[PDB]
């Protein structure tokens, strides 16, 4: 106890989180018991009685070949951080998304030193489940700053600034942003000098008592932009190809209202066979090429509204390819991309969507400083079973599950 | 006193109950003093003075064999004001997840709640007064020194107390297994029957040292073990005998009880179906309305009676043996499965019916069934089973590659047991060269409910059929069905409806709509079908009428 605990107070008129515990594998339950038993000896967590009605989910991820414990503090965050982002919030630099290389460093070990406010410890309660409802479960609560809770970096913020101050003086062109458990370090240096300066920061933090398990994940934010909608270009065109072209250009009119399709729809008068090859007129080629360059320029009036939340839609494209869009209001995409994992006998759908969500969330953290809510194309119960299998991040974004994706599949590739 | 109390607070910004009671005649007043004095001697309650405390209504009532009275305190207003506690174990353990032990012992603790003390700084809120006949004689005030019967935090505190009491015993006896459930204890071990009886007696004397009584008379229970509607035999488990009543008139209440026993019997009795009887309960508008039966419901109930006629049992879990699950289709959007480790012995069975939506194919329903079994296995056994599925590998590999959603199925081997699961038709990905192109369209007036559906082909063939009592969605599906009727084995269809296309591209196998079913039949009878889409009012090649 270096200094008296920072008093944590929830927003007035709101009770703590009471979330259910999803059933876990016997393998995962045994891992959590070993971790929590060690955390109990080291004074981090302590068992609680029945007068603690709150609960918070706890899972087991693979960090590596050893088990790592991940807590779903999403509900406690919205019950504390929404009032704590105003009080001890961390500002987000808008220049981090402009560097050439951004490395992520896990600094979640620092919170294990700071004590947690005794009155607030009852809200960090979590339960290790039992198989077949044999025992009522093992209920712990946190005595130190817990990982995954957004209040721990806000409390440790002043401590983090002091440690990073000498490094910032030696490197005034390096951007360092902290999000919960991760230290985003971006620079414009060469790849060799970047990893050298990253190692210097690793050795700098390590010699100040801040251990970071990264003894052998870099990004490049200058390549993250709204991808342009490409129109197919074939040597010849048939009735069916022009139908898919006008239908796609009509859907694009909701985004670019300066698109005309009267000359493309006049090339086919009607009652023609689908496989009938139809050459284009000059005004059809003029209207086509005119609608190509207007589709290769970004939209007008598309800005980020901090008051509104971020929304990310993902859709399956097959052959290990996934496309996504990030917006706040419909058809106002702030950022679009396409995630692609190497196919083979080493991958499946759920693994690809999981890594895609983690890649999108990391991009949204760097660009805007907050995570989006995902509209996932997967069955709810299915995703809630296997999402921890391939999850490597230390945070958990919000998500909901959709069931009716239209013909958009072809329109976004 | 040796049992450490649990600190209980009132809800933030609240105060104890100040309700008072003056009814209940003089006959039961002295009948309640007979109980209050013996409870005061045992330290369960203590008289409190005129310190202006709180109060709570307390009632009295007899029962059958009236030699034993009953004191019933109504803590309804108090439970609204006390804090919230960690919820007691909601789900009971399932017998199919239990392991085989040579000996099993059951012990129920008498006066369980009155054996655990109450927090001292909270006992003042549980006060109550026995009314005297108002001859200006005052009322006798009491308050509880233990967990009150019917109080909000009594079950959760007693469970925490019982668990702590078992800790110094389970530490010296790791070979025996003690299950905990409400006021009962289910001890079991592989110890020899001689030393097992001694371990039970040692545990009884241990619990008695903390003030917990245990049946010394005989041994209380024998291997039948009627527990929570189950039969727990030393080498098998089954549900308690199911009784299906027979009536001429059936009400909504009885049909709810009927599907309740049927769903309960579906744990081990394989083949139970409840689709038709639940279709009767689709009408939520009633309490005791006489709902008439259907012909399909009477037949389905007759099939359930034939299954319940022959008793079938289940077995316990052996972790050394693998966990297997096998699924079969019943043909009405219903599915059935069995979880087992041995060929002739089942751990438990179950069924899955898709009552969500109206259009779905068998491959999707098979996936959702595997999901339900996967969750149930992680709950009951903590692992996931190996699946034997009646579906070719090329079948499922083609479906998930085409399906817009993300799916995942664990290690599964193909079992060749009809009816197998297979896509009955696949639409062409590219337009068919040399096939007649149908430009279909359907419209309807929502007020008159009289629409029309037709088509125009590239060969100069046109047709318009009038429709009565339909909607715009029905006409658009009717227009596509009309093209399939009047076309060869290869046909190209072009529609302007995003609705009718999404229903077809889902490739469903069955549906309640006979129109969609006949569309499915046409799509199977064809050889190659390519269905394209164009915007509704762009005048590309579509001809529509208003
Ligand atoms: N009434 C009641 C009652 C008793 C139990 C219960 O007892 C058990 C405790 C520990 C164990 F390792 C196995 C147990 O039961 C397996 C079945 N069994 C029965 C008799 C026999 O001789 N052998 C045998 O295997 C477990 C539970 F979850 C609920 N219970 C309700």
From Swiss-Prot, chain A:
Changing residue 149 to F: 10% loss of DNA-directed DNA polymerase activity. 22% loss of RNA-directed DNA polymerase activity. Changing residue 185 to A: 37% increase of DNA-directed DNA polymerase activity. No loss of RNA-directed DNA polymerase activity. Changing residue 179 to F: 70% loss of polymerase activity. No loss of polymerase activity. Changing residue 185 to M: 27% increase of DNA-directed DNA polymerase activity. 10% loss of RNA-directed DNA polymerase activity. Changing residue 163 to V: 70% loss of DNA-directed DNA polymerase activity. 64% loss of RNA-directed DNA polymerase activity. A motif (Tryptophan repeat motif) lies at residues 383-399. The record marks 386, 399 as: Essential for RT p66/p51 heterodimerization. Changing residue 386 to A: Almost complete loss of RT p66/p51 heterodimerization. Complete loss of polymerase activity. Changing residue 182 to E: Drastically reduced incorporation of phosphorothioate nucleotide. Loss of pyrophosphorolysis (reverse of the polymerase reaction). No effect on RNase H activity. Changing residue 63 to A: Strong decrease in RT binding affinity for all dNTP substrates and in catalytic efficiency. 100-fold decreased sensitivity to ddNTP inhibitors. Changing residue 220 to A: Complete loss of RNA-dependent DNA polymerase activity. Complete loss of RNA 5'-end and 3'-end cleavages. It comes from the Viruses. Changing residue 63 to R: 10-fold decreased sensitivity to ddATP and ddCTP inhibitors. Changing residue 390 to L: No effect on RT p66/p51 heterodimerization. Changing residue 383 to L: No effect on RT p66/p51 heterodimerization. Changing residue 180 to V: 58% loss of polymerase activity. No loss of RNase H activity. Changing residue 153 to G: 34% loss of polymerase activity. No loss of RNase H activity. Changing residue 395 to L: No effect on RT p66/p51 heterodimerization. Changing residue 152 to A: 74% loss of polymerase activity. 56% loss of RNase H activity. Changing residue 295 to S: 31% loss of polymerase activity. No loss of RNase H activity. This is p51 RT. It comes from Human immunodeficiency virus type 1 group M subtype B (isolate BH10).
